[model samples]
Target: ANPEELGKVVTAIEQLDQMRIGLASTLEGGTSEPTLDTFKAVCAPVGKQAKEIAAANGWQVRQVALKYRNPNHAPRTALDVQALNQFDNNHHLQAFWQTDKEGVHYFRRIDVQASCLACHGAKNRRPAFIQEKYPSDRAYGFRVGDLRGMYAVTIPQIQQA
Candidate 1:
C-alpha cells in the first residue's frame, strides 16, 4: 500500500507553523520591547531545529521574503518571487504545492502580524539594531495583514521499486 505522502507534508508544515506561533507570542509578550535582535535570536534556533528535522526526513525548508530585511532571507529563485506575488494577489490561496525537479514543493505565506511591527515596521520606527544591520533595508513600511513572505518546503518523492 502507498503511504500517505500528503499527510507527511501536512505534519512537516505543522511543525513550522507551531514554531512561528510560539516565536510571535514570545516576542509580543516579552517584558521589554522586542527588537530585530530578539526576533533573530528566537528564530535562529528554531530554524536550525527545523533544518535538522527536514534533513533527517529527506526534506528541505526555507523561509523567504520578497522585501527581505535580512539579506539571508531573500528569495533564492524565480519560483519564490512568483509565490510571493501569488500570495499577494489571492487571499484564498494561502498555500500551493507543485512538482519540481527537486521534488514536491509547498509554499505557505507569512503575513505581517501586529507583533512583527517592532522589527519589520516603518523605517523611522525600527529598532537601531535593524537600522545598523540592514542600512538599506526594503522590508519595512508594512502594516498588519500585509504579505511578508513564505515558508518553502521541498520533500523528495519516494522512489518506486
Candidate 2:
C-alpha cells in the first residue's frame, strides 16, 4: 500500500551498492591482488553506510548472504534463504519483494562483476587476511557474474505510508 516508502528502501540500496561497485572499479584497475587494504577500502563501509540509511529512514537494513564469512551476515530466516536462492538461481532477478512479521521487504541482488574476482574468485585464493580472520569463509569460488549476496531493506509498519 505504501509505494513511496518502498521506493525509498530501493533507492537506498542502489545508493550503497553503487558506492561499493565504484570502489571495486577503482581497485581492479590498480591491483591484481586482493589485500586487506582492498577490503578496507571497498567493503568495510557497507555496514556503517547502512546504519546511516536505517537511522534516517526508520527502516531495517541488512546485508544477507548465504556463504557468509561473518555469522552476523548470515540469512536470518527461511524467507531470507528463499530469496537468496531465488537470486542465486536467476541472475536476471536483480530485486525482489516480500513481506513478513517485520514488514514489507526489498531484496536487491549484489552481483559479481569483472572487478570482484581477485578477492572472491577461487577457494584458497582469497586475500590471506580474510582467510585468517574467518576460517569458515565460503564466499569464494565465484565467477564474474555470480550472485554475491543481497541488500535486504524492510520498511516497518510504522514507517509505511
Query: What TM value does model 1 have?
Result: 0.77
Please give the lDDT score for candidate 2. Answer: 0.79
Per-candidate TM vs. native? 0.77, 0.85
Q: lDDT for each of the candidates? A: 0.72, 0.79
Measured by lDDT, the strongest candidate is 2
Q: Residue 91 CA error for candidate 2 (Å)?
A: 2.3
lDDT of 1 by residue, 12-97 (tens): 77777677666766555222444554535545665676677777766777778888866867888888888888998997777888
Error of 1 at 102 (Å): 2.8
How much is the lDDT of residue 153 in candidate 2?
84
Find the 10 residues in a row with the least total lDDT in model 2. Answer: 26-35
Runs of candidate 2 with Cα error greater than 4 angstroms are 29-40, 158-161
Each model's backbone clash number: 0, 0
